[PDB]
């Protein structure tokens, strides 16, 4: 399932330990860099497309 899953956590159930992050610009939990509330592919699509402040195509 997918659609119902985002709704599952979107409404906080019983135990604190049943929440799991969600890429609200793609829709998944795997590798969602919680800082941004974005998955990794959603992350890169945002930063790349210039729609993300503070970043930098880092070159350190």
């Amino acid at each position: 399932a997918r659609k119902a899953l985002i709704e599952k956590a979107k409404r906080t159930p019983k135990f604190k330990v049943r929440a799991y992050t969600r890429c609200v610009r793609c829709g998944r939990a795997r590798s969602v860099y919680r800082f941004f509330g974005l998955c990794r592919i959603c992350l890169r699509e945002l930063a790349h497309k210039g729609q993300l402040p503070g970043v930098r195509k880092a070159s350190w």
Partner: protein, 207 residues
């Protein structure tokens, strides 16, 4: 293979952020959340006149949007009864002070997003791919540009083999910086598939 966004590499002094506002560490998320939502529902509505850039500023209620349209004419509406509803909803789903500002760019055949917009939309209306698109690169270098390239990838005419038909005219120095390039990809949707329209346009040195 890749190419990488010239953009996601032009963020030196050649591409200043689309969204300019500082954020708190915690805050960051919800801010960008509402932000991307703004651009989002804006996209569906204020497309009508070519939505290129979407300049964003935020200080503290400072929700300043500098919508680079293409021609704000039949889009602000008579007396601003259309700018009205949009700023309205903007306020409806932004718990702060909204702004509109229809800053269209002087010239059409510049800033590749709207270039590729018309481009893909020609195929969206089934039209001649190579003919009218070669006419598009044409129009670019017929405006005063320095290098235009339009890659169009996908199911042309159906026929299994999704070619990547490509045209160009004028220098496109993608490894350079000062030179400055504008990149824009339109998301072309054939009634029978999704082909990707993409465009680079060159400008010049010194700047």
């Amino acid at each position: 293979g890749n190419k990488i966004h010239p953009i996601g590499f032009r963020l030196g002094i050649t591409r200043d952020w689309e969204s300019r506002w500082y954020a708190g560490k915690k805050q960051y998320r919800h801010l960008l959340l509402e932000d991307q939502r703004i651009r989002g529902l804006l996209e569906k509505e204020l497309y009508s006149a070519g939505l290129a850039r979407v300049d964003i500023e935020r200080a503290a209620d400072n929700v300043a949007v500098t919508v680079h349209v293409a021609k704000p004419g039949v889009v602000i509406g008579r007396g601003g009864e259309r700018i009205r509803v949009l700023r309205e909803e903007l306020a409806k789903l932004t718990g702060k002070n909204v702004a509109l500002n229809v800053q269209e760019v002087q010239n059409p055949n510049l800033s590749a997003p709207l270039v590729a917009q018309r481009v893909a939309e020609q195929i969206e209306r089934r039209f001649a791919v190579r003919r009218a698109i070669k006419q598009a690169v044409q129009r670019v270098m017929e405006s005063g540009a320095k290098g235009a390239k339009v890659i169009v990838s996908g199911r042309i005419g159906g026929a299994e083999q999704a070619r990547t038909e490509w045209a160009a005219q004028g220098r496109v120095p993608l490894h350079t910086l000062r030179a400055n390039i504008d990149y824009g990809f339109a998301l072309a949707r054939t009634t029978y598939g999704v082909l990707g329209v993409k465009a680079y346009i060159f400008l010049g040195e010194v700047i």
